[PDB]
């Protein structure tokens, strides 16, 4: 009661100091010095491919680094690897648990990860010599469902869980190398930096955090949103990122200025954002929505510059190729669509 | 160049051939979400009836898969969105043991009015009926301290009771049923239904009730297509 209240008031004064420093380092808004830049005009992307073959809703998807092969996870119990140029199914792996919520694709192209409501990350080997695709490893140790997972290389993987912690695993041994704690809600997404040194995590506490991977500690905290954060993605250069939340708003947070620079929202938009991504140059911010549509935002002028309306259910996942040529979308109507 | 094209087409053909069998087996099973309010002792009935447990049963050669979440955290507004395509949410209500009845009512009201579960039907099993029976027969374990409007409530001239019952136990059970049906009927946002029942560790034919209720759910889902 006594020490507790002294410590709470010390924390509140520290919050006041931090907010005062943030406001001190803020002198001009982003849209105040970029107002005269020429707009992107109109972005009219249309559907090139449509990948059929899933039976249930698609929860996740991940492009390969060769910008040709795509992975997708459906809640029917399937992990399908497509060749997007010819729309051929290269692989169809059956999962032990039907409730997969995420999937990843190693930057070498050898392995595939998937996890879900079983609190386990299964690692499958794709390039087995004279064999099929079988479970290479099973990473267990989380206490809640897996919401996201990304490879760092063929040996390390970072996973977000519903038990409010992130974990960095070594795949060979199968043990948690590092545990990232600090969030007070379900971590819903994560994003690796252009290099593999830092990452960002967004949770259901309306807060995002920056984590140094090599140490295991939280660098900074960003508290702009006012509801659950569902998606997060780094700006291409690595000195900013963007988040989408359930309050029907996207935000662009800065890493060196330590605040949010821009807000992407409207009045006819009252649906939450499910996924966000950046184009190769970083000028376009694509965001999927609960209203079955996707929006292309001018990341520097905060004007919406196009729509991707081709889905009949909730747009669940969104991904731009590493060369910036296509945009894959996956929805709850069991279809993957490539736009260009 | 051309040979890789043809080998890729062959691999895709084999993949599709297996996906057809998978689609055949997938449409035949019915997935049910067993969602107890907690502390409901429903482990006993799911015995007689680590992140998620699965229970398979079969009625009239129809296969049902019932899922129960195990090692999940307390908050459930995110992982429950996975169960919108489920054919039925089985909701086990720990009626007497307390204010757990109000917590079950609030959970049911949140599931009923959710945007994504707005098309899923709920099969409502009010478990632990005999515990409540002796509780209200004793005249000591009262629920009116939590529901003051319990008095002034009369069992209708309808609602046939069991001959091995007391008017007051029937009164309490129908009070709970109407408390849930108030929430069930007050909202028309989703085209879904609620099938309330009564059960305990005494009635072992609950899978027949689940079978009939899923049959009715599927009938009313088919009956939708003939309209616009």
């Amino acid at each position: 009661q006594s020490e507790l209240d002294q410590l709470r008031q010390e924390a509140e004064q520290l919050k006041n100091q931090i907010r005062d420093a943030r406001k001190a380092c803020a002198d001009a808004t982003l849209s105040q010095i970029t107002n005269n830049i020429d707009p992107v005009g109109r972005i009219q992307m249309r559907t090139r491919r449509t990948l059929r073959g899933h039976l249930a809703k698609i929860y996740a998807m991940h492009w390969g680094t060769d910008s040709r092969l795509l992975v997708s996870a459906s809640q029917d119990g399937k992990l399908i690897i497509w060749d997007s140029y010819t729309t051929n199914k290269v692989h169809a792996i059956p999962l032990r648990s039907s409730w997969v919520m995420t999937c990843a694709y190693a930057p070498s192209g050898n392995y595939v990860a998937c996890g879900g409501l079983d609190n386990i990350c299964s690692i499958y080997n794709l390039k087995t010599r004279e064999g099929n695709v079988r479970v290479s490893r099973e990473l267990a140790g989380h206490t809640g469902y897996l919401s996201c997972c990304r490879f760092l290389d063929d040996n390390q993987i970072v996973t977000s869980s519903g038990d409010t912690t992130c974990a960095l695993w070594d795949i060979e041994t199968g043990q948690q190398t590092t545990t990232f704690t600090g969030h007070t809600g379900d971590v819903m997404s994560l994003s690796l930096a252009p290099d593999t040194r830092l990452f960002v995590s967004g949770a259901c506490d309306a807060s995002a955090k920056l984590w140094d991977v090599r140490e295991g500690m939280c660098r900074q905290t960003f508290t702009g949103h006012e509801s659950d954060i569902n998606a997060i993605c780094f700006f291409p250069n690595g000195n900013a990122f963007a988040t989408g939340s359930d309050d029907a708003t996207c935000r662009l947070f800065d890493l060196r200025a330590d605040q949010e620079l821009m807000t992407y929202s409207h009045d006819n938009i009252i649906c939450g954002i499910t996924s966000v991504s950046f184009s190769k140059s970083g000028r376009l911010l694509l965001a999927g929505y609960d209203d079955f549509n996707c929006n292309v935002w001018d990341a520097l002028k905060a004007d919406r510059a196009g729509v991707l309306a081709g889905h009949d259910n909730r747009v669940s996942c969104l991904g731009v190729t590493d060369d910036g040529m296509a945009v894959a979308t996956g929805s709850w109507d069991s279809f993957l669509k490539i736009w260009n | 160049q051309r040979n890789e094209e043809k080998a890729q087409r062959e691999a895709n053909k084999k993949i599709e051939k297996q996906l057809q069998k998978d689609k055949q087996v997938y449409r035949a099973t019915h997935r049910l979400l067993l969602l107890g309010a907690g502390e409901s002792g429903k482990n006993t009935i799911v015995k007689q009836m680590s992140g998620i447990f699965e229970t398979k049963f079969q009625v009239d050669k129809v296969n049902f898969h019932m899922f129960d979440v195990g090692a999940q955290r307390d908050e459930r507004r995110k992982w429950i969105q996975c169960f919108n395509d489920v054919t039925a949410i089985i909701f086990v209500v720990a009626s007497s043991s307390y204010n757990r009845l109000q917590a079950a009512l609030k959970l049911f009201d949140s599931i009923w009015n959710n945007k994504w579960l707005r098309d899923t039907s709920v099969i409502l099993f009010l478990n632990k009926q005999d515990l409540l029976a002796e509780k209200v027969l004793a005249g000591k374990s009262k629920i009116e301290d939590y529901f003051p409007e319990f008095a002034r409530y009369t069992t209708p001239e309808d609602a046939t009771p069991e001959p091995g019952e007391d008017p007051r136990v029937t009164r309490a059970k129908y009070f709970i049923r109407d408390e849930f049906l108030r929430i069930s009927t007050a909202s028309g946002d989703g085209r879904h239904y609620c099938y309330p029942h009564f059960t305990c560790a005494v009635d072992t034919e609950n899978i027949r009730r689940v079978f009939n209720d899923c049959r009715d759910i599927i009938q009313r889902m088919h009956l939708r297509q003939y309209e616009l």
Partner: nanobody, 128 residues
């Protein structure tokens, strides 16, 4: 930053009166359903009352119907609970909860043990 500050708790005699207030900052107060929950000594969190975005729909738990009255003012973003004719079963820590999504009619996790959009609570002891 979503901030909720409760005020007005304290000691009261049986049959007394109180008025808990809840000041909200960091979000559009007009878009969310609001709730009053409570935790009694030696028990768990239980729901007490809730009010919609306007005030047209208002609900109470059983043991407070007739006595408590919930209200909200969107002009200054404040939530009020007027507690009348208290009794020793009302001794608890009261919390002002906001349910997570705007423009919705459902509020899932306001009673969970580690909910994020809850306040710190005010103590209300009814003694003699």
């Amino acid at each position: 930053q979503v901030q909720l500050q409760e005020s007005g708790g304290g000691l009261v005699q049986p049959g007394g009166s109180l008025r808990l207030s809840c000041a909200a900052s960091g979000f559009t107060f007009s878009n969310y359903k609001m709730n009053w929950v409570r935790q009694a000594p030696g028990k768990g969190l239980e729901w007490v009352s809730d009010i919609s975005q306007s005030g047209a729909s208002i609900s109470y738990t059983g043991s407070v119907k007739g006595r408590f009255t919930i209200s909200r003012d969107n002009a200054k973003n404040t939530l009020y609970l007027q507690m009348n004719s208290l009794k020793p079963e009302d001794t608890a820590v009261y919390y002002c909860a906001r349910c997570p999504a705007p423009f919705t009619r459902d509020c899932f996790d306001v009673t969970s043990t580690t909910y994020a959009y809850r306040g710190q609570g005010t103590q209300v002891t009814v003694s003699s």
